[PDB]
Short mmCIF file of C-alpha atoms and ligand atoms in Angstrom, two decimals:
data_model
loop_
_atom_site.label_atom_id
_atom_site.label_comp_id
_atom_site.label_asym_id
_atom_site.label_seq_id
_atom_site.Cartn_x
_atom_site.Cartn_y
_atom_site.Cartn_z
CA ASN A 30 0.00 0.00 0.00
CA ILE A 31 3.10 2.21 -0.08
CA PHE A 32 5.43 0.96 -2.81
CA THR A 33 4.56 0.44 -6.48
CA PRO A 34 5.30 -2.98 -8.06
CA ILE A 35 8.47 -2.73 -10.16
CA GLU A 36 6.88 -3.57 -13.51
CA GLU A 37 4.27 -0.83 -13.14
CA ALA A 38 7.04 1.53 -12.01
CA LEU A 39 9.10 0.70 -15.09
CA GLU A 40 6.25 1.70 -17.42
CA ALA A 41 5.84 5.04 -15.65
CA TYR A 42 9.61 5.54 -15.91
CA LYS A 43 9.49 4.52 -19.56
CA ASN A 44 6.77 7.16 -20.03
CA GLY A 45 8.98 9.96 -18.70
CA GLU A 46 7.66 10.08 -15.14
CA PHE A 47 9.79 10.53 -12.04
CA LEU A 48 9.91 7.82 -9.40
CA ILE A 49 10.51 8.52 -5.72
CA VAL A 50 13.22 6.07 -4.69
CA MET A 51 14.06 4.96 -1.15
CA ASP A 52 16.78 2.50 -0.05
CA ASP A 53 14.29 0.08 1.52
CA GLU A 54 11.04 0.17 3.53
CA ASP A 55 12.43 2.03 6.54
CA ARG A 56 10.45 5.09 7.64
CA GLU A 57 13.68 7.01 8.28
CA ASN A 58 14.96 6.66 4.70
CA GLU A 59 15.27 9.92 2.75
CA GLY A 60 13.76 10.00 -0.74
CA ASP A 61 15.23 10.83 -4.14
CA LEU A 62 13.48 11.82 -7.36
CA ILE A 63 14.79 9.74 -10.28
CA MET A 64 13.87 9.74 -13.98
CA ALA A 65 15.34 8.83 -17.36
CA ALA A 66 18.11 11.19 -18.45
CA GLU A 67 16.97 11.17 -22.09
CA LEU A 68 13.42 12.18 -21.16
CA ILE A 69 13.94 15.12 -18.80
CA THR A 70 12.47 18.33 -20.19
CA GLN A 71 12.94 21.97 -19.16
CA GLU A 72 9.69 21.73 -17.19
CA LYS A 73 10.63 18.47 -15.46
CA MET A 74 14.07 19.80 -14.53
CA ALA A 75 12.39 22.91 -13.13
CA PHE A 76 10.21 20.56 -11.05
CA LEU A 77 13.21 18.53 -9.86
CA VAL A 78 15.14 21.65 -8.81
CA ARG A 79 12.09 23.24 -7.16
CA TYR A 80 11.56 20.34 -4.75
CA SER A 81 15.14 19.12 -4.24
CA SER A 82 18.59 20.11 -2.99
CA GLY A 83 19.35 21.35 -6.48
CA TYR A 84 22.62 19.39 -6.56
CA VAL A 85 21.39 17.58 -9.68
CA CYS A 86 23.40 14.52 -10.70
CA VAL A 87 23.34 12.34 -13.80
CA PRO A 88 24.19 8.65 -13.25
CA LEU A 89 25.91 7.06 -16.26
CA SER A 90 27.60 3.69 -16.62
CA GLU A 91 31.39 3.73 -16.30
CA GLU A 92 31.62 2.66 -19.94
CA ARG A 93 29.52 5.62 -21.10
CA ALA A 94 31.42 8.05 -18.88
CA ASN A 95 34.67 6.74 -20.38
CA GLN A 96 33.30 7.25 -23.89
CA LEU A 97 32.40 10.85 -23.08
CA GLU A 98 35.77 11.49 -21.46
CA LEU A 99 34.27 12.30 -18.05
CA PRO A 100 36.96 11.04 -15.62
CA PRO A 101 36.46 10.78 -11.85
CA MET A 102 36.65 14.22 -10.27
CA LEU A 103 39.46 12.91 -8.08
CA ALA A 104 42.07 10.83 -9.91
CA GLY A 105 30.91 6.77 -2.13
CA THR A 106 29.24 8.67 -4.98
CA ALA A 107 31.65 8.62 -7.91
CA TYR A 108 31.49 12.18 -9.19
CA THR A 109 33.15 12.91 -12.52
CA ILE A 110 34.36 16.36 -13.53
CA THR A 111 31.24 18.49 -14.06
CA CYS A 112 30.01 19.54 -17.51
CA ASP A 113 27.65 21.48 -19.78
CA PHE A 114 26.54 20.54 -23.29
CA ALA A 115 27.99 23.38 -25.38
CA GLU A 116 25.48 23.84 -28.21
CA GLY A 117 22.18 25.28 -27.05
CA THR A 118 23.24 26.42 -23.58
CA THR A 119 24.27 29.79 -22.17
CA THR A 120 24.31 30.01 -18.36
CA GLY A 121 24.38 26.23 -18.04
CA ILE A 122 22.56 26.38 -14.71
CA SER A 123 19.09 27.17 -16.10
CA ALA A 124 16.43 24.45 -16.08
CA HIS A 125 16.61 24.51 -19.89
CA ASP A 126 20.38 24.07 -19.95
CA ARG A 127 20.67 21.44 -17.25
CA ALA A 128 17.90 19.47 -18.97
CA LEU A 129 19.62 19.70 -22.35
CA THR A 130 22.95 18.65 -20.86
CA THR A 131 21.27 15.70 -19.16
CA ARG A 132 19.53 14.50 -22.33
CA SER A 133 22.84 14.98 -24.17
CA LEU A 134 24.73 12.77 -21.72
CA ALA A 135 22.23 10.01 -22.51
CA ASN A 136 22.28 10.54 -26.30
CA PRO A 137 24.33 7.71 -27.94
CA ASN A 138 25.44 10.14 -30.63
CA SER A 139 27.02 12.69 -28.27
CA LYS A 140 30.80 13.06 -28.43
CA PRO A 141 33.44 14.11 -25.85
CA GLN A 142 34.10 17.45 -27.56
CA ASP A 143 30.39 18.34 -27.38
CA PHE A 144 30.74 19.20 -23.70
CA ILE A 145 32.38 22.01 -21.78
CA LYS A 146 34.16 21.11 -18.55
CA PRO A 147 33.75 22.11 -15.83
CA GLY A 148 30.01 22.74 -15.96
CA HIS A 149 26.73 22.77 -14.04
CA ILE A 150 25.72 19.11 -14.21
CA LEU A 151 27.29 16.44 -11.97
CA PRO A 152 27.72 13.14 -13.84
CA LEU A 153 28.12 10.04 -11.66
CA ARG A 154 29.80 6.75 -12.54
CA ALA A 155 27.67 3.68 -11.79
CA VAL A 156 29.73 0.55 -11.15
CA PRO A 157 29.54 -2.41 -13.55
CA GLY A 158 26.91 -4.85 -12.32
CA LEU A 159 24.85 -1.94 -11.02
CA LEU A 160 22.62 -2.87 -8.04
CA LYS A 161 24.11 -6.35 -7.76
CA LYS A 162 27.47 -4.72 -7.01
CA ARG A 163 26.54 -1.47 -5.22
CA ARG A 164 23.08 -0.58 -3.89
CA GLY A 165 23.48 3.14 -4.46
CA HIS A 166 21.01 5.54 -6.02
CA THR A 167 23.54 5.97 -8.82
CA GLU A 168 23.29 2.29 -9.73
CA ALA A 169 19.52 2.41 -9.19
CA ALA A 170 19.11 5.16 -11.79
CA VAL A 171 21.12 3.34 -14.45
CA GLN A 172 19.40 0.06 -13.53
CA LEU A 173 15.95 1.62 -13.96
CA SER A 174 16.87 3.05 -17.35
CA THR A 175 18.33 -0.30 -18.42
CA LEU A 176 15.24 -2.25 -17.30
CA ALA A 177 13.11 0.31 -19.12
CA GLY A 178 14.96 -0.37 -22.37
CA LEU A 179 16.39 3.16 -22.39
CA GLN A 180 19.92 4.56 -22.54
CA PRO A 181 21.90 3.60 -19.39
CA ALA A 182 21.61 7.11 -17.96
CA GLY A 183 19.41 8.71 -15.33
CA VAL A 184 19.06 11.94 -13.40
CA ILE A 185 18.47 12.33 -9.67
CA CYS A 186 18.25 14.70 -6.71
CA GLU A 187 17.24 14.61 -3.03
CA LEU A 188 13.73 15.72 -2.03
CA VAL A 189 13.70 18.56 0.53
CA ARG A 190 10.92 19.98 2.72
CA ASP A 191 9.76 23.52 1.92
CA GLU A 192 9.16 24.28 5.61
CA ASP A 193 12.69 23.84 6.94
CA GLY A 194 14.89 22.40 4.20
CA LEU A 195 15.18 19.03 5.93
CA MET A 196 15.39 16.00 3.64
CA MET A 197 12.07 14.21 3.11
CA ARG A 198 11.70 10.97 5.07
CA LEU A 199 9.26 8.23 3.99
CA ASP A 200 6.10 9.83 5.41
CA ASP A 201 6.75 13.11 3.60
CA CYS A 202 7.69 11.24 0.42
CA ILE A 203 4.37 9.38 0.51
CA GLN A 204 2.61 12.73 0.89
CA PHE A 205 4.67 14.23 -1.95
CA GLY A 206 3.89 11.25 -4.17
CA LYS A 207 0.16 11.50 -3.54
CA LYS A 208 0.12 15.26 -4.08
CA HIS A 209 2.06 15.15 -7.35
CA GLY A 210 0.98 11.72 -8.59
CA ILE A 211 4.44 10.16 -8.44
CA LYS A 212 4.95 6.45 -7.70
CA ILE A 213 7.34 5.29 -4.99
CA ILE A 214 9.68 2.28 -4.96
CA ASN A 215 12.73 1.18 -2.99
CA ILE A 216 16.10 -0.29 -3.97
CA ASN A 217 15.65 -3.58 -2.09
CA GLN A 218 12.45 -4.01 -4.06
CA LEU A 219 14.45 -3.47 -7.26
CA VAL A 220 17.24 -5.88 -6.23
CA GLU A 221 14.65 -8.58 -5.57
CA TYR A 222 13.19 -8.11 -9.05
CA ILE A 223 16.50 -8.48 -10.92
CA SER A 224 17.58 -11.38 -8.71
CA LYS A 225 14.34 -13.38 -9.06
CA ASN B 25 14.83 53.59 -5.04
CA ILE B 26 16.03 50.16 -6.16
CA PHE B 27 19.62 49.65 -5.04
CA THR B 28 20.88 50.01 -1.46
CA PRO B 29 23.91 52.29 -0.84
CA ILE B 30 27.04 50.17 -0.43
CA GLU B 31 27.89 51.21 3.13
CA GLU B 32 24.40 50.32 4.35
CA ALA B 33 24.63 47.06 2.42
CA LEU B 34 27.95 46.22 4.07
CA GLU B 35 26.45 46.60 7.55
CA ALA B 36 23.62 44.23 6.64
CA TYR B 37 26.20 41.79 5.25
CA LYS B 38 28.29 42.15 8.40
CA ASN B 39 25.13 41.33 10.37
CA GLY B 40 24.71 38.00 8.59
CA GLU B 41 22.06 39.08 6.08
CA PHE B 42 21.92 38.02 2.45
CA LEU B 43 22.24 40.61 -0.29
CA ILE B 44 20.67 40.19 -3.70
CA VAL B 45 23.41 41.03 -6.20
CA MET B 46 22.97 41.99 -9.87
CA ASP B 47 25.72 42.77 -12.41
CA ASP B 48 24.50 46.33 -12.98
CA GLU B 49 21.18 48.21 -13.23
CA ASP B 50 19.82 46.40 -16.30
CA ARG B 51 16.34 44.96 -15.81
CA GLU B 52 17.36 41.80 -17.67
CA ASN B 53 20.10 40.82 -15.19
CA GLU B 54 19.50 37.69 -13.14
CA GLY B 55 19.92 37.95 -9.36
CA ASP B 56 22.14 36.04 -6.95
CA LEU B 57 21.82 35.67 -3.18
CA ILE B 58 25.19 36.29 -1.51
CA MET B 59 26.16 36.28 2.17
CA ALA B 60 29.24 35.84 4.36
CA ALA B 61 30.51 32.25 4.39
CA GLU B 62 31.36 32.33 8.11
CA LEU B 63 27.85 33.46 9.04
CA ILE B 64 25.64 31.03 7.13
CA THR B 65 23.51 28.91 9.48
CA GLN B 66 21.46 25.77 8.86
CA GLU B 67 18.36 27.96 8.54
CA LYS B 68 20.00 30.42 6.15
CA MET B 69 21.32 27.58 3.97
CA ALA B 70 17.82 26.08 3.90
CA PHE B 71 16.55 29.49 2.77
CA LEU B 72 19.22 29.79 0.08
CA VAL B 73 18.54 26.31 -1.28
CA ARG B 74 14.76 26.77 -1.13
CA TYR B 75 14.81 29.82 -3.41
CA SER B 76 17.78 29.09 -5.67
CA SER B 77 19.18 26.62 -8.20
CA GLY B 78 20.67 24.67 -5.32
CA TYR B 79 24.09 24.61 -7.00
CA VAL B 80 25.55 26.34 -3.93
CA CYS B 81 29.05 27.75 -4.40
CA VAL B 82 31.58 29.15 -1.95
CA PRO B 83 33.84 31.92 -3.32
CA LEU B 84 37.30 31.94 -1.70
CA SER B 85 40.44 33.85 -2.60
CA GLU B 86 42.99 31.88 -4.62
CA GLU B 87 45.37 32.17 -1.68
CA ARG B 88 42.86 30.63 0.72
CA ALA B 89 41.94 27.86 -1.72
CA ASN B 90 45.65 27.07 -2.09
CA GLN B 91 46.01 26.90 1.68
CA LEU B 92 43.10 24.46 1.90
CA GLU B 93 44.46 22.38 -0.98
CA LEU B 94 41.41 22.91 -3.19
CA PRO B 95 42.90 22.89 -6.72
CA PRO B 96 40.97 23.91 -9.85
CA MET B 97 38.58 21.12 -10.80
CA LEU B 98 40.27 21.04 -14.20
CA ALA B 99 43.64 22.28 -15.45
CA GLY B 100 34.72 31.45 -16.67
CA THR B 101 33.63 30.33 -13.20
CA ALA B 102 36.70 28.88 -11.46
CA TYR B 103 35.48 25.71 -9.75
CA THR B 104 37.79 23.76 -7.46
CA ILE B 105 37.33 20.10 -6.61
CA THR B 106 34.19 19.86 -4.45
CA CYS B 107 34.29 19.13 -0.72
CA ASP B 108 32.60 18.43 2.62
CA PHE B 109 33.92 19.31 6.07
CA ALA B 110 34.43 15.88 7.65
CA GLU B 111 33.65 16.40 11.33
CA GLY B 112 29.99 17.03 12.05
CA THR B 113 28.60 16.03 8.66
CA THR B 114 26.97 12.86 7.40
CA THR B 115 25.13 13.16 4.07
CA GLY B 116 27.02 16.36 3.27
CA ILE B 117 24.09 17.63 1.17
CA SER B 118 21.82 18.61 4.08
CA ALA B 119 21.33 22.30 4.88
CA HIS B 120 23.14 21.64 8.16
CA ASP B 121 26.11 19.97 6.47
CA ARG B 122 26.43 22.41 3.58
CA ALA B 123 26.28 25.30 6.06
CA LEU B 124 28.92 23.72 8.30
CA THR B 125 31.21 23.07 5.33
CA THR B 126 30.76 26.66 4.17
CA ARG B 127 31.59 28.16 7.57
CA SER B 128 34.56 25.80 7.79
CA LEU B 129 35.94 27.03 4.46
CA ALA B 130 35.94 30.54 5.91
CA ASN B 131 37.42 29.52 9.29
CA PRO B 132 41.12 30.54 9.23
CA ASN B 133 41.84 27.63 11.57
CA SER B 134 40.61 24.96 9.15
CA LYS B 135 43.21 22.65 7.63
CA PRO B 136 43.41 20.77 4.29
CA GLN B 137 42.92 17.41 5.99
CA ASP B 138 39.70 18.59 7.65
CA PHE B 139 37.84 18.17 4.37
CA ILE B 140 36.73 15.19 2.32
CA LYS B 141 36.97 15.49 -1.46
CA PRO B 142 34.88 15.27 -3.54
CA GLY B 143 31.92 16.63 -1.61
CA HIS B 144 28.69 18.59 -1.82
CA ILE B 145 29.92 22.19 -1.73
CA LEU B 146 31.44 23.92 -4.77
CA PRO B 147 34.33 26.22 -3.78
CA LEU B 148 35.25 28.93 -6.29
CA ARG B 149 38.59 30.67 -6.78
CA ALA B 150 38.31 34.47 -6.89
CA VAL B 151 41.13 36.12 -8.82
CA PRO B 152 43.62 38.38 -7.00
CA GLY B 153 42.44 41.98 -7.27
CA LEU B 154 38.84 40.80 -7.03
CA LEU B 155 36.36 43.16 -8.75
CA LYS B 156 39.15 45.32 -10.18
CA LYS B 157 40.38 42.31 -12.16
CA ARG B 158 37.19 40.30 -12.84
CA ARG B 159 33.63 41.51 -12.32
CA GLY B 160 32.24 38.11 -11.46
CA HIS B 161 29.88 37.13 -8.67
CA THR B 162 32.78 35.12 -7.25
CA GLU B 163 34.92 38.23 -6.87
CA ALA B 164 31.90 40.21 -5.64
CA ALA B 165 31.35 37.74 -2.79
CA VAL B 166 34.95 37.84 -1.61
CA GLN B 167 35.00 41.62 -2.07
CA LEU B 168 31.90 42.04 0.10
CA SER B 169 33.36 39.89 2.87
CA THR B 170 36.65 41.82 2.68
CA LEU B 171 34.97 45.24 2.81
CA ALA B 172 32.93 43.94 5.75
CA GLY B 173 36.11 43.05 7.62
CA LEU B 174 35.27 39.34 7.53
CA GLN B 175 37.19 36.31 6.26
CA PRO B 176 37.65 36.52 2.45
CA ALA B 177 34.93 33.93 1.82
CA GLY B 178 31.33 34.06 0.67
CA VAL B 179 28.50 31.76 -0.38
CA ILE B 180 26.22 32.25 -3.38
CA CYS B 181 23.43 30.83 -5.53
CA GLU B 182 21.09 31.95 -8.31
CA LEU B 183 17.52 32.97 -7.47
CA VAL B 184 14.85 30.96 -9.30
CA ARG B 185 11.10 31.49 -9.74
CA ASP B 186 8.78 29.01 -8.01
CA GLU B 187 6.29 29.11 -10.87
CA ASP B 188 8.47 27.93 -13.75
CA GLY B 189 12.06 27.59 -12.55
CA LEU B 190 13.24 30.53 -14.64
CA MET B 191 16.00 32.64 -13.11
CA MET B 192 14.81 35.83 -11.40
CA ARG B 193 15.38 39.00 -13.43
CA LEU B 194 15.48 42.43 -11.75
CA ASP B 195 11.73 42.90 -11.34
CA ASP B 196 11.31 39.56 -9.58
CA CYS B 197 14.40 40.25 -7.47
CA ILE B 198 12.91 43.54 -6.28
CA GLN B 199 9.72 41.69 -5.35
CA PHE B 200 11.77 39.00 -3.58
CA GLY B 201 13.79 41.59 -1.68
CA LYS B 202 10.69 43.40 -0.48
CA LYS B 203 8.89 40.17 0.47
CA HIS B 204 11.81 38.84 2.51
CA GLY B 205 13.40 42.11 3.60
CA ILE B 206 16.64 41.64 1.68
CA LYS B 207 18.62 44.58 0.27
CA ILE B 208 19.70 44.71 -3.38
CA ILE B 209 22.96 46.01 -4.85
CA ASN B 210 24.84 45.61 -8.12
CA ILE B 211 28.48 44.97 -8.98
CA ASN B 212 28.98 48.17 -11.00
CA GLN B 213 27.87 50.01 -7.88
CA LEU B 214 30.42 48.06 -5.83
CA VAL B 215 33.23 48.75 -8.31
CA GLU B 216 32.51 52.48 -8.11
CA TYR B 217 32.78 52.34 -4.33
CA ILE B 218 36.17 50.60 -4.27
CA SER B 219 37.53 52.83 -7.03
CA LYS B 220 38.25 56.57 -7.17
O1 5RP C 28 20.86 9.81 -4.21
C1 5RP C 28 21.71 10.54 -3.73
C2 5RP C 28 21.99 10.58 -2.24
O2 5RP C 28 21.10 9.71 -1.50
C3 5RP C 28 22.53 11.44 -4.66
O3 5RP C 28 21.96 11.63 -5.97
C4 5RP C 28 24.00 10.91 -4.78
O4 5RP C 28 24.80 11.85 -5.53
C5 5RP C 28 24.11 9.52 -5.48
O5 5RP C 28 23.70 8.51 -4.57
P1 5RP C 28 24.57 7.20 -4.24
O6 5RP C 28 25.97 7.58 -3.57
O7 5RP C 28 23.67 6.31 -3.26
O8 5RP C 28 24.84 6.35 -5.58
O1 5RP C 29 26.86 33.95 -9.53
C1 5RP C 29 26.63 32.96 -10.21
C2 5RP C 29 25.85 33.04 -11.50
O2 5RP C 29 26.06 34.30 -12.17
C3 5RP C 29 27.16 31.60 -9.74
O3 5RP C 29 27.09 31.38 -8.32
C4 5RP C 29 28.62 31.34 -10.27
O4 5RP C 29 29.13 30.10 -9.74
C5 5RP C 29 29.65 32.46 -9.89
O5 5RP C 29 29.53 33.53 -10.84
P1 5RP C 29 30.78 34.17 -11.62
O6 5RP C 29 31.34 33.18 -12.76
O7 5RP C 29 30.24 35.54 -12.26
O8 5RP C 29 31.97 34.53 -10.60
#
């Protein structure tokens, strides 16, 4: 009565919807908004920033990050050097620009020289094996996109309360999901699905 | 009737208030919230994140960044590798943690080893000479802290509209300043003050 079955969640994700993702069923877990990188629009990025910490990250597989020449920031959340997609962006930080950069990171046709570094988007490197190797939200994002038949790239950010800026625990996430019509799932639920 | 005189603005800044900073008087400029790094509290960081892009940056002088061993992210906005103050933080992204890290970056007693890299705060390197060399918001932040007799460190983020996520131009910034009791100034105005 709280979490959406994975297969229904995958269709919503496939249809460009966000999913609220928790680690497991614990009430003290803090929620994250996650959606397909290739499907995030200016409006959806505006939504993500409005209700989150604003430290928007874009999980990519290590193979894809290597292809785009996005090395670890430092030669626990594997940040790569930040970036902006050059063509079509100005300030880089706008909802329009961050959305374009995110879709560009997912686009199979994008090339290393298409991006400016540093930038305003934080790409993350998901480990090979995804959730079977590391149960992080980074691996969850790429796993969701993979299961959805989309490019192995996602975009995420932490939900925050408007009242005091505290991260949203399960109860508030359930309220947020009902108010905005967003389904909720948890990583353990996802691991169970891909394991049997 | 729009911009606050610099000396009055400095007293507000010295008193831990934010200042809305524009490049000059143009109505098309987008506004930034800027305040002293050493004075940002959990509540003030929550406020900043709530009404901004969330990509919170911490302007520091190049000399201070060198002392803290925060090299340029890559060898335009001069980002250094990101960081979190180790002691007292957990998730690093929380208003509490980002505020603590920010105050720590300003604290002259902080040491290189006190921080974990990468992190959730984006330090910026202000060029020597500040606003007389580069009229960026980075230099403006450090300049304000310097003129206020505080540590050469500031914290900033771009104001964004709740309705559509678009950055706040002058008109909206004036409305924001009046609604929240925050003074507005512009960089050209600051350059005039430090010159002559
Ligand atoms: O979701 C998050 C924190 O909860 C953030 O997006 C983080 O940058 C990536 O998460 P993780 O380190 O679990 O892969
Ligand atoms: O203020 C800003 C947007 O304008 C940002 O905080 C930026 O990181 C610093 O700006 P600048 O490159 O002008 O020093």
